[PDB]
Short mmCIF file of C-alpha atoms and ligand atoms in Angstrom, two decimals:
data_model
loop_
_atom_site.label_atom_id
_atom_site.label_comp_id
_atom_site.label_asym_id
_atom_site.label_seq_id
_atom_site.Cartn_x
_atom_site.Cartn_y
_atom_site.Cartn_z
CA UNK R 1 0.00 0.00 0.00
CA UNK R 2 0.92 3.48 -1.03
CA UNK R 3 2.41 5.42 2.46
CA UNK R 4 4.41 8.58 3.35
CA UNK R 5 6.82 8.85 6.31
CA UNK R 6 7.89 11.71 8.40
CA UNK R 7 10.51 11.97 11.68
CA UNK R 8 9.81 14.78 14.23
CA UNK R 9 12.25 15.97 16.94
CA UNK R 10 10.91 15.66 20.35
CA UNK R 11 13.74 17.51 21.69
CA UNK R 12 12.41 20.16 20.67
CA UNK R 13 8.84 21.51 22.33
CA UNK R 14 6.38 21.46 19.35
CA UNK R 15 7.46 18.28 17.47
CA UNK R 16 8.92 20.11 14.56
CA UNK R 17 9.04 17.40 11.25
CA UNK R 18 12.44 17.29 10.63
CA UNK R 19 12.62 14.44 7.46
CA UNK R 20 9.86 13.77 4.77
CA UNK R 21 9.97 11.17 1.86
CA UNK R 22 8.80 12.26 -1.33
CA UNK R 23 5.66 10.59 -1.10
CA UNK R 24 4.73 13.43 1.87
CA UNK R 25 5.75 15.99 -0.22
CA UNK R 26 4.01 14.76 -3.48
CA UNK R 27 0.60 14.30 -1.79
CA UNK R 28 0.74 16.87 0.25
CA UNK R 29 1.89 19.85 -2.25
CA UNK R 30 4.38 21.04 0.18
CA UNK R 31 8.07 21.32 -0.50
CA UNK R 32 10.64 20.72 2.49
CA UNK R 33 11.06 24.62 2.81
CA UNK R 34 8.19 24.64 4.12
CA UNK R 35 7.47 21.16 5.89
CA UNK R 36 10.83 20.82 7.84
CA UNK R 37 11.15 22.97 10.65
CA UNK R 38 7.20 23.18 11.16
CA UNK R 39 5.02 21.11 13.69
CA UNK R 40 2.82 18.87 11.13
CA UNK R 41 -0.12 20.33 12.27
CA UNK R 42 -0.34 22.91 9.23
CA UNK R 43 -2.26 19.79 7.25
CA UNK R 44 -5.24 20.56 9.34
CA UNK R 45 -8.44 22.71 8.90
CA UNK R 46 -11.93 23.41 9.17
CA UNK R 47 -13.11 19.64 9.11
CA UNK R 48 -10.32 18.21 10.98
CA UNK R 49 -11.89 16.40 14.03
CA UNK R 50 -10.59 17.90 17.16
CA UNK R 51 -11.42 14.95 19.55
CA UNK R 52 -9.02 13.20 17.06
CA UNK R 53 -6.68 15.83 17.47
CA UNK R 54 -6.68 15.56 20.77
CA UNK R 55 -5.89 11.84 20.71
CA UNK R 56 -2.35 12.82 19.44
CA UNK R 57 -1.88 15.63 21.29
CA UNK R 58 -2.16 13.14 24.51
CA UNK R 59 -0.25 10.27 23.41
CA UNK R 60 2.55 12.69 22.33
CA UNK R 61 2.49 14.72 25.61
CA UNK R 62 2.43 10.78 27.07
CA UNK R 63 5.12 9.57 24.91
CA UNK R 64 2.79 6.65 23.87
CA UNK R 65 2.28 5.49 19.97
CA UNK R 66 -1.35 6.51 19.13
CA UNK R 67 -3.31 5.66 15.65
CA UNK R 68 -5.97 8.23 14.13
CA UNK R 69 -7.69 9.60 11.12
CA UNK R 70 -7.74 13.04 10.33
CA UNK R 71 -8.98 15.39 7.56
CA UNK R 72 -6.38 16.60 5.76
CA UNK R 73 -5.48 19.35 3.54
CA UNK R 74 -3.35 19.97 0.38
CA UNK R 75 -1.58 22.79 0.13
CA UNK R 76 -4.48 23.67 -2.78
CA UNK R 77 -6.97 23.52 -0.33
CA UNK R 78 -8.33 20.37 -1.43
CA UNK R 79 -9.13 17.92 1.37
CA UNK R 80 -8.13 13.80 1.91
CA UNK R 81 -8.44 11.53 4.17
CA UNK R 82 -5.19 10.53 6.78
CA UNK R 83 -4.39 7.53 8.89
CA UNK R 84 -1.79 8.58 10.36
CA UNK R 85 0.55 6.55 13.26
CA UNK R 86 2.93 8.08 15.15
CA UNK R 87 5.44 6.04 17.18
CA UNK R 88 7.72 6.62 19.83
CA UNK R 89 11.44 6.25 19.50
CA UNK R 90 13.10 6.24 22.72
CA UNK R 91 16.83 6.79 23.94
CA UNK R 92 17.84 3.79 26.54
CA UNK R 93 17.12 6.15 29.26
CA UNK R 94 13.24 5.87 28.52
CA UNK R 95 13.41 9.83 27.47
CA UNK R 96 11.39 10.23 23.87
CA UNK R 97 14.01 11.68 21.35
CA UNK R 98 11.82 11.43 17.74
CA UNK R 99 8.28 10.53 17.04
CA UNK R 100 7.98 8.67 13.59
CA UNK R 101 4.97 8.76 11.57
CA UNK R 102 3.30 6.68 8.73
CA UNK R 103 0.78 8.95 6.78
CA UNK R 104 -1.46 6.96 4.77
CA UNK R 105 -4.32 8.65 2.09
CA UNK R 106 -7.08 6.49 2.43
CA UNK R 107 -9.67 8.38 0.72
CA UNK R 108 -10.07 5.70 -1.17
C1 FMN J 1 0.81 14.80 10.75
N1 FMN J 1 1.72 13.83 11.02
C2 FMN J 1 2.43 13.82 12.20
C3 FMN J 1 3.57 13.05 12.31
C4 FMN J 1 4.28 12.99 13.51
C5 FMN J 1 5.52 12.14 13.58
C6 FMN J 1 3.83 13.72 14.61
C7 FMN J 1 4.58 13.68 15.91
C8 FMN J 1 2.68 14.50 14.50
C9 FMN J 1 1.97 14.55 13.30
N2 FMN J 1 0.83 15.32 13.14
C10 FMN J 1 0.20 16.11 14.25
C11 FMN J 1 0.68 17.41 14.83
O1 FMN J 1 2.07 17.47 14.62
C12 FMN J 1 0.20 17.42 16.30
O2 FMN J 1 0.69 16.28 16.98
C13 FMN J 1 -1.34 17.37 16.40
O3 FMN J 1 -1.94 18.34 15.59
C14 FMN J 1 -1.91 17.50 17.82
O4 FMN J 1 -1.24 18.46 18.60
P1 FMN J 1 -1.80 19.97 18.75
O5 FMN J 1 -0.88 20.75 19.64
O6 FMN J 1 -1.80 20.60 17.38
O7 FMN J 1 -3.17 19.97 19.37
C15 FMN J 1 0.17 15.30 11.92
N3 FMN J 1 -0.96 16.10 11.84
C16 FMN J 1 -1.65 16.17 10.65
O8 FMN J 1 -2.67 16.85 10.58
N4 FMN J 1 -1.19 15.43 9.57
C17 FMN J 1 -0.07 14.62 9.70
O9 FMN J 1 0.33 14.04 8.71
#
């Protein structure tokens, strides 16, 4: 099945996405100047669910993996449909230092 993948830095407060494969940038519309750096939030709008936003906000605050859909939106303004995983990735001494997420379009 067709996927994207992203790494964000939890070292650093807001999550900021710091790698993208193509994939996220072709079905997004976004180039890497303006996906790395940014919290991956800027794919949301108006219809975005937030009790499913919440969901991720909590498991990242937790440091737990957490699985959700989500409207999303292209940088065209066009909207699709995101199941999106994030996962932990922990140093040895249990602190979180990346989240990793697979981004799947399942409008179908
Ligand atoms: C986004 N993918 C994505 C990938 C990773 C690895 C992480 C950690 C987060 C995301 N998000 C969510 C966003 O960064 C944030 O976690 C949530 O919006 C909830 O927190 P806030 O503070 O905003 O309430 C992704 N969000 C998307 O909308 N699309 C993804 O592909």
């Amino acid at each position: 099945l067709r996927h994207t993948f992203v790494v964000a830095d939890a070292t650093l407060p807001d999550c900021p996405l710091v790698y993208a494969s193509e994939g996220f940038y072709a079905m997004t519309g976004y180039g890497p100047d303006e996906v790395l750096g940014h919290n991956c939030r800027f794919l949301q709008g108006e219809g975005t669910d937030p009790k499913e936003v919440q969901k991720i906000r909590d498991a990242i605050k937790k440091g737990e993996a957490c699985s959700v859909r989500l409207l999303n939106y292209r940088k065209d303004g066009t909207p699709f449909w995101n199941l999106l995983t994030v996962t932990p990735i922990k140093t040895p001494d249990g602190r979180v230092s990346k989240f990793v997420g697979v981004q799947v379009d399942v409008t179908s």
